[PDB]
Write a protein that binds this ligand. Structure first.
Ligand SMILES: Nc1ccc(S(N)(=O)=O)cc1
Length: 1723
């Protein structure tokens, strides 16, 4: 860091702004002549003769340019000279251009050619244009110019089918229909504001081309805005590494080549400069300058000058007279009218049609308003933006058809429309500037544009340009209009405000980056090329050619200002910058840094409305405003009429600004023309300044001032006071009708309770009654409902339900309405919590559930208030008290168990040498938690709880308990449960190699199927399982011996009991406790957990003493964690995500530049995007490959495996990523490289946070929400997922500390600050999941009566918490009476539900018994509502089609998620599948499971996540189908039962009901089968009996293909069937009939069922069925799995009268074409 020096900026700045001329000298063309007059002097420069054509360079006729570019040039047959000299550069290259041409030369159509080139790269063959793939931004300088640019461009690109729309003004949070526009047209200041936001990439992602029209605005006071835009754009292009083409369009002024440098233009390829010869129509010009200072006489001179120049054009010649006041237009038109008539009606009949050549047309349109009507009968007309509206557009008409001879207009016309006159006269050049608080000389931009309206391109060969101005000082205008006024940099003027925008953006983090930023500015180039202009000496430049000192000084000076005004924290030493919230707001709302200081110094929570209007007045953007003498009176009359007192402020600027704002809200008409210009200036600014004060004050939680300031923003926008009728906000309601309701002492709210007749009677306007009714019901209105529940004594969880109660109209509300959810304390003094809420039109009249947490303080208040205020509408709010009167706070939690700084335990504390051998090579001692826990877990047989921050190494704490069991028992039995499967598979691998390879005990992992799980539980010493797998086993604990005699039972992550799928965990742990006390040979419970606030309750529950319960606080974590929480106030998720991109990189460089980093992102697509962004930012930081820590050839053997191209590319650059579309191998590979240190950064999706055996030094969580398609909203990550992610920032061996940065919405910030720094409180949710467990317990006779059900509950964790946190479970009170009452009402409701669902029977009000439906639900582990639904929907006539629908409606498929835009995807799927659904909602998980079920049968391949869902669906499809069989057989329906069995075999093989049986064979296709049906092969048996040479002769093959096909036929069921009727003769009506089926196969069975498309290995299952096919009668059924051979017995009851015809059916649940049928008869 080099020494610095503070500069005087007011000395280096070009004070005079745009009017600055560094052009000390000057020259003139050939015609020099000047005429001296009395009062003034005339200067003449003649129109340049046209330059002869150069070598070739002929005009390019439209046919020459490409066929696709033909369109958009209708009306043209050839291109202009300019447009031809660069058709090649514009259309055939992508090079950056800078075009210098005179105004009117047609630079427009050059830019259009550039635009058409971009459109040309998305022609799409037959589809019109890939319109959603690109975007073009067009920066124009004036608002009026923008609007007509849109008009014209739309006319040219309609044939292309392209949307070009305006984006300028103040419309904040601009509509997402900008996604529908491809050419955004705007002003620089607007585009600067949009790109200051951060999420800019949401707009600019697709921007392939930006155009800078009238780029010579650089020299203007507005110039820095242009410098910022381009410097920002250029830098962003470097950071995305995505090409954006820049086109500069400029007027012919000096320094242009330096602008070409600025725009990264190649001088040789993309620079074009054309002098004044290339004007559209040659211009003869007069520059009259007045030498007379006397004010009144000065303007008489001027008026005399206008007069005589007009008259040199009598008949067929039009004159435009530009002036500089909305009203001066008339006082000049009538003045020349007074000048002409007075001197003998001078040259009248301007329209030389005394007999109506243009009089008949000018008197026919005469009935248009005020001054127009006056001047219309003859040649005079007028034009201004003075709200003249459609008149001025029909003045454009008549002036176009050259009827109107003389038009005097404001500058607006010159930019706004395309009408040129033969001669133009500009009068005065003086302009009032509200910002400077005075008159100044007008903008170079303005002059150039209007003077370039001289000479009609088609109707004129010459143009006359008269510029009237003051003689003194002004040949400025001559050099301006004759290629001589240079373009300079004004950057010093606005340096601190620009610096701040770049700091807030994250683009500059310190002084160093700041001087680099300056290097991208236009200022830099100019300081190098003209150091003397910019206050630098040639000697400084010589010894410092890059201007390091100057740029550092410049930056340091600015930074000091920003630090002083509290926008930026800046220290002299490091040169580092820190953004403050004040700076963030200042940048975003474009407010100068002086103002921020004032606001900060003045705003306080008790500001009055009177004082708030004062603070607005003191804003620095008003600092030059004064109170003139000639307005003193009008100001005093305004004051009396406005409502807010303006105290102590006499007529000072402060007071004037104050009443100017009030007068604007009050809609008071003005007459003072200086005053009107000042009002437009403060009122156009008032929106942003107010909104800035709003955000400042909202963020400090200031309740009263947030209300005041928000209302103030709404009042300025709606132009009405808060105390008028809300109905004024509807524009289409006649204003006198509204003032009529205000004239009553009548609350608006009451209109809701009146019909259209009572309303009409109230206003005594009967006609108006119905419309007022309509609008009353259009007004936004929300209803609120709250659901409260205490989490701890300091915090409560709040579920706010928001219910829209109004009629939606898109003409009034548009596509959405926004609201602020605020929660305030009792006194309404503090905002405890707030958040934005967006009510989309799509989901109006739809419930909305917002969940959040609020703080509370032990001497509790009676109420909090929740207000939901609209962000745009006045008087649109709804309030809801939240009573704390009956609130019961939870029991205060005990202190954490003290961490004992013991001497670290050595590995030799394990005495066993075999045991030590698997720890000694990794580490010498155990961590302080491991050593403290050691004596109790390794030298006891008793129950223990371990609560430590995730990462503390709790895994081996359980390993202690396992080793200790192995010591005690030879063939010990240990069951380990983890809530997550991905965790189970991780511990398996880790313990298999530890306990089976090293120690040779058995380690097994339970699976989906029960039989093979029972054997695994048999021979296993270590049983790994998830809770449901163990639930389905341990239900039958009475019957399965192996479940009882287990020695050690381990539960990991027991805090997950509080989460989703937590009840099943709670059930099985409780069962294990019950078994233990009921067998009197205790089972050892070891429970591992994250730090719990309520560990005592978990300890008591699992039978742990306090001395054997270890619960450590998060701040005692072996490796100290440094946690940072970073909020982003951005509601729109996709935007928020994008704006996190840079902070992600900055976190890596700040917190872990050398050590490993994991970045968690919310999705698959984001994982790839984030990694690519890190890479591209790396390269723009010039440190490309800085995350690679080996050579490329080190990686290449591993990368060769991978099949993702992009994954190779990123890894090659040091960054990996992990999503679920990668192979399990590809993921193992990436993890290996990461752990090795080779690659420094992995980006992973959150779903993978459980299945990653990888640790970093820095974990970054990039957003904490994900999309829920089911409720059309983004929802928060479970705190369990976040805790798990954070636990990854943990490397005990190498790191002194772990770091974690969590990036989230501001609405989520306070939440993380609580539940990450403190132990986590957990509750049960078993009460909302009670049915399936009661049903199972009743089926196994563990529950026989109501009392047993109450007793069962005493073993749960639910039972414990109910006393501790009653209001959480809806216990109104904590007495023992309340507990029993609740437990009883709970068992009552559950048992009554189970009975109504036909699962159980309640008898004598106390006893319960299992029924058929209950028994099948427990047997297949199916939810009770599912088999309730099955029995409800199944009938005698259901086919496979209805079966699929029924099964996909199961409640197990309720948790199949709907993801972002999966609806569009599923809608397409619906049109591709065989069966079409009726009224299908595409955000319905059951609709999706249906579609996926058909997609799987049709062998379609889909998105990766749709295939994961297809796998989840299939993982349950078989058990559900078997249930259907059971229910159908119970009802005795034959056909549906057989159908369900076909479904099982056709789900397995993944084929349809009438698909060829050959599809089961590998490698076969419809191409193959076609030649198989032709020869006569239809069955699998038919290829089986074929002899080898003939077999592969049928079609194509390979040695490996035939090998697989043959392998299939050796596992295919070759079974022979044999049957007999036992005592077939002595059988009688009503008696028993016994059918004995013998099954045997000519093969010894070994090998699972082969089914590549079914993702769960299953064994052959069979149904033996007997039926009557005539009556559709299922007589008897049996389900079996046979192995080699087996005897099957099944009986039934004989009917009457002898002979009956029966059928025996043999049915697979795994293969098609195996089904055998045998018919027979009896009696
Ligand atoms: N402007 C703004 C402020 C706060 C939030 S918040 N609290 O919802 O994140 C969003 C936008």
């Amino acid at each position: 860091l080099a020494p610095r020096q503070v500069l005087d900026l007011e000395d280096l700045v070009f004070t005079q702004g745009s009017h600055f001329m560094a052009n000390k000298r000057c020259q003139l063309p050939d015609g020099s002549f000047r005429r001296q007059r009395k009062g003034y002097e005339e200067v003449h420069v003649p129109a340049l003769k046209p330059k002869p054509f150069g070598s070739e360079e002929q005009l390019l006729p439209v046919e020459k340019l490409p066929k696709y570019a033909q369109a958009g040039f209708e009306g043209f047959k050839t291109l202009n000279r300019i447009q031809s000299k660069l058709y090649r550069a514009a259309l055939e290259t992508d090079e950056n251009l800078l075009l210098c041409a005179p105004t009117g030369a047609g630079k427009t159509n050059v830019a259009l050619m550039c635009m058409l080139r971009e459109i040309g790269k998305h022609i799409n063959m037959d589809g019109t244009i890939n319109v959603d793939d690109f975007k073009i931004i067009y920066i124009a300088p004036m608002r009026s110019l923008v609007q007509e640019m849109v008009g014209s461009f739309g006319k040219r690109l309609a044939t292309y089918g392209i949307t070009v729309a305006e984006l300028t003004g103040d419309h904040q949070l601009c509509k997402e229909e900008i996604s529908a526009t491809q050419i955004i047209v705007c002003t620089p200041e607007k585009w600067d504001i949009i790109t200051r936001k951060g999420g800019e990439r949401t707009y600019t992602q697709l921007v392939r081309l930006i155009i800078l029209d009238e780029i010579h605005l650089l020299h203007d006071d507005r110039g820095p805005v242009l410098e910022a835009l381009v410097a920002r754009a250029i830098r962003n292009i470097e950071m995305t590494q995505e090409d954006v083409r820049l086109i500069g369009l400029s007027a012919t002024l000096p320094n242009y080549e330096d602008v070409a440098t600025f725009l990264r233009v190649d001088p040789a390829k993309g620079l074009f400069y054309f002098d004044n010869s290339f004007r559209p129509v040659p211009l003869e010009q007069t520059y009259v300058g007045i030498t007379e200072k006397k004010a009144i006489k000065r303007f008489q001179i001027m008026n005399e000058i206008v007069y005589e120049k007009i008259m040199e054009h009598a008949g067929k010649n039009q004159v435009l007279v530009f002036v500089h006041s909305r009203k001066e237009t008339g006082k000049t038109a009538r003045a020349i009218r007074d000048m002409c008539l007075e001197k003998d009606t001078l040259g009248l009949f301007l329209r030389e049609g005394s007999a109506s050549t243009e009089v008949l047309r000018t008197e026919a349109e005469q009935c248009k308003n005020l001054e127009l009507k006056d001047l219309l009968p003859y040649g005079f007309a007028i034009h201004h933006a003075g709200m003249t509206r459609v008149d001025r557009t029909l003045v454009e008409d008549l002036f176009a058809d050259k009827h109107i001879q003389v038009l005097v207009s404001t500058a607006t016309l010159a930019w706004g429309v395309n009408l040129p006159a033969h001669t133009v006269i500009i009068k005065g050049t003086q302009v009032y500037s509200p910002e400077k608080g005075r008159w100044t000389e007008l903008g170079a931009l303005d002059i150039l544009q209007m003077l370039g309206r001289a000479g009609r391109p088609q109707y004129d060969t010459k143009g006359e340009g008269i510029l009237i101005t003051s003689h003194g000082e002004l040949q400025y205008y001559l050099s301006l209009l004759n290629q001589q006024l240079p373009i300079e940099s004004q950057m010093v003027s606005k340096l601190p405000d620009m610096l701040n925008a770049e700091i807030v953006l994250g683009n500059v983090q310190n002084a160093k980056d700041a001087v680099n930023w300056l290097g991208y500015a236009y200022l830099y180039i100019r300081m190098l090329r003209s150091p003397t202009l910019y206050g630098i000496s040639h000697d400084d430049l010589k010894g410092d050619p890059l201007l390091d000192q100057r740029r550092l000084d410049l930056v340091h000076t600015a930074a000091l200002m920003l630090d002083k005004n509290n926008l930026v924290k800046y220290d002299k030493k490091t040169g580092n910058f820190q953004v403050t919230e004040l700076g963030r707001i200042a940048s975003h709302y474009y407010i100068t840094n002086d103002t921020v200081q004032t606001y900060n110094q003045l705003l306080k929570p008790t500001l009055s409305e009177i004082e708030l209007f004062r603070v607005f007045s003191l804003s620095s953007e008003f600092k030059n405003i004064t109170v003139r003498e000639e307005e003193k009176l009008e100001l005093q009359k305004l004051l009396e009429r406005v409502p807010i007192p303006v105290k102590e402020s006499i007529e000072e600027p402060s007071a004037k600004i104050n009443v100017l704002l009030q007068a604007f809200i009050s809609q008071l008409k003005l007459e003072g023309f200086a005053l009107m210009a000042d009002m437009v200036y403060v009122t156009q600014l008032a929106g942003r300044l107010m909104r800035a004060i709003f955000e400042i004050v909202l963020n400090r939680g200031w309740a009263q001032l947030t209300d005041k300031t928000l209302n103030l923003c709404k009042m300025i926008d709606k132009r009405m006071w808060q105390s008028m009728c809300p109905l004024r906000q509807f524009r289409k309601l006649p204003e006198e009708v509204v003032k009529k309701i205000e004239k009553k002492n009548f609350p608006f709210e009451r209109l809701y309770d009146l019909n259209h007749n009572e309303i009409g009677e109230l206003i005594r306007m009967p006609k108006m009654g119905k419309t007022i009714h309509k609008y009353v019901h259009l007004f936004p209105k929300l209803e609120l409902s709250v659901h409260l529940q205490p989490i701890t004594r300091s915090t409560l969880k709040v579920e706010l339900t928001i219910t829209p109660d109004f009629q939606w109209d898109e003409k009034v509300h548009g596509s959405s309405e926004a609201f602020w959810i605020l929660v305030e304390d009792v006194d309404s003094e503090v905002i405890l919590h707030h958040e934005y809420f967006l009510l989309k039109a799509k989901y109006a009249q739809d419930e909305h559930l917002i969940t959040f947490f609020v703080p509370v303080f032990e001497p509790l208040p009676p109420q909090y208030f929740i207000r939901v205020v609209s962000d745009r509408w006045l008087s649109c709010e709804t309030q809801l008290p939240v009573s704390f009167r009956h609130l019961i706070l939870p029991e205060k939690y005990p202190p954490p168990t003290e961490l004992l700084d013991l001497q670290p335990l050595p590995v030799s504390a394990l005495r066993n040498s075999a045991f030590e051998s698997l720890y000694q090579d990794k580490f010498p001692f155990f961590n302080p938690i491991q050593t403290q826990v050691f004596n109790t877990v390794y030298n006891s047989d008793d129950n223990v709880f371990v609560g430590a921050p995730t990462g503390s190494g709790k895994t081996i704490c359980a390993e202690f308990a396992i080793l200790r069991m192995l010591l005690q028992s030879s063939e010990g039995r240990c069951v380990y449960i983890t809530p997550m499967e991905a965790l189970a598979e991780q511990v398996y691998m880790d313990w298999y190699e530890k306990f089976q390879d090293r120690l040779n005990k058995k380690v097994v992992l339970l699976t989906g199927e029960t039989s093979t799980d029972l054997k695994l539980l048999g021979k296993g010493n270590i049983i790994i399982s998830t809770p449901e797998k163990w639930d389905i086993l341990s239900r039958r604990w009475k019957q399965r011996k192996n479940v009882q005699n287990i020695n050690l039972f381990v539960v990991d992550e027991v805090h997950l009991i509080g989460g989703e799928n937590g009840p099943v965990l709670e059930v099985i742990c409780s069962r294990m406790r019950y078994i233990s006390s009921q067998i009197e040979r205790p089972i050892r419970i070891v429970a591992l957990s994250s730090s719990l606030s309520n560990a005592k309750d978990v300890a008591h529950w699992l039978g742990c003493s306090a001395t054997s319960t270890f619960n450590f606080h998060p701040n005692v974590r072996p490796v100290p964690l440094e946690l940072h929480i970073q909020g982003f106030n951005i509601s729109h998720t996709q935007t928020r995500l994008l704006s996190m991109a840079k902070p992600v990189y900055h976190a890596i460089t700040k917190h872990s530049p050398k050590k490993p980093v994991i970045v968690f992102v919310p999705s698959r697509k984001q994982t790839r995007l984030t990694a690519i962004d890190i890479l591209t930012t790396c390269a723009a930081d010039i440190q490309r490959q800085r995350f690679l820590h080996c050579t490329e050839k080190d990686l290449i053997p591993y990368l060769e495996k991978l099949s993702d191209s992009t994954l190779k590319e990123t890894l090659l650059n040091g960054v990996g990523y992990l999503h679920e579309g990668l192979s399990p191998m590809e993921r193992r590979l990436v993890e290996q490289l990461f752990s090795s240190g080779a690659i420094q950064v992995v980006v992973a999706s959150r779903s993978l946070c459980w299945g990653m055996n990888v640790a970093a030094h820095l974990v970054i969580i990039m957003d904490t929400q994900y999309y829920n398609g089911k409720i059309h909203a983004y929802v928060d990550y479970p705190i369990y997922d976040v805790l798990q992610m954070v636990g990854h920032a943990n490397r005990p061996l190498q790191d002194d500390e772990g770091r974690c940065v969590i990036m989230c919405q501001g609405s989520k910030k306070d939440f993380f600050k609580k539940f990450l720094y403190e132990p986590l409180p957990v509750e049960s949710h078993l009460d909302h999941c009670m049915h399936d467990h009661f049903n199972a317990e009743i089926v196994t006779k563990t529950i026989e009566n109501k009392q047993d059900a109450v007793d069962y509950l005493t073993w749960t964790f639910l039972y414990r918490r109910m006393t501790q946190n009653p209001n959480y479970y809806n216990l109104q009170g904590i007495s023992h009476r309340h507990l029993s009452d609740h437990l009883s009402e709970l068992v009552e409701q559950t048992l009554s539900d189970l009975e109504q669902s036909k699962c159980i029977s309640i008898e004598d009000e106390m006893d319960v018994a299992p029924l058929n439906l209950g028994m099948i639900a427990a047997y297949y582990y199916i939810n009770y509502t599912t088999i309730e639904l099955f029995s409800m929907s199944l009938n005698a006539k259901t086919k496979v089609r209805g079966l699929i629908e029924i099964i996909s409606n199961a409640a197990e498929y309720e948790n199949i998620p709907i993801r972002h835009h999966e609806d569009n995807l599923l809608r397409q799927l619906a049109q591709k599948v065989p069966h079409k659904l009726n009224n299908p909602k595409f955000n319905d998980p059951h609709v999706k499971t249906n579609l996926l079920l058909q997609a799987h049968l049709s062998r379609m391949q889909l998105s990766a996540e749709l295939q994961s869902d297809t796998e989840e669906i299939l993982s349950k499809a078989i058990r559900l189908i078997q249930a259907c069989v059971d229910v159908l057989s119970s009802n005795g329906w034959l056909s549906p039962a057989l159908a369900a069995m076909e479904l099982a075999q056709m789900v397995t093989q993944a084929m349809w009901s009438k698909d060829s049986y050959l599809k089961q064979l590998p490698h076969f296709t419809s191409e193959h089968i076609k030649r198989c049906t032709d020869k006569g092969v239809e069955s699998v048996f038919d290829i089986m009996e074929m002899e080898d040479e003939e077999r592969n002769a049928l079609l194509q093959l390979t040695d490996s293909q035939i090998a697989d096909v043959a392998r299939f036929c050796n596992r295919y069921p070759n079974i022979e069937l044999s049957y007999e009727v036992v005592d077939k003769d002595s059988i009688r009506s009503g008696g028993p009939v016994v059918v004995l089926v013998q099954l045997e196969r000519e093969e010894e069975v070994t090998g699972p069922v082969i089914a590549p498309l079914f993702p769960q290995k299953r064994e052959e299952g069979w149904w033996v069925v007997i039926g009557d096919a005539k009556s559709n009668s299922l007589i008897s059924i049996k389900r079996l799995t046979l192995q080699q051979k087996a005897k099957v017995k099944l009986d039934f009851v004989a009917p009457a009268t002898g002979a009956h015809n029966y059928t025996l059916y043999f049915m697979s649940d795994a293969y098609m074409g195996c089904d055998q049928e045998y018919k027979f008869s009896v009696d």
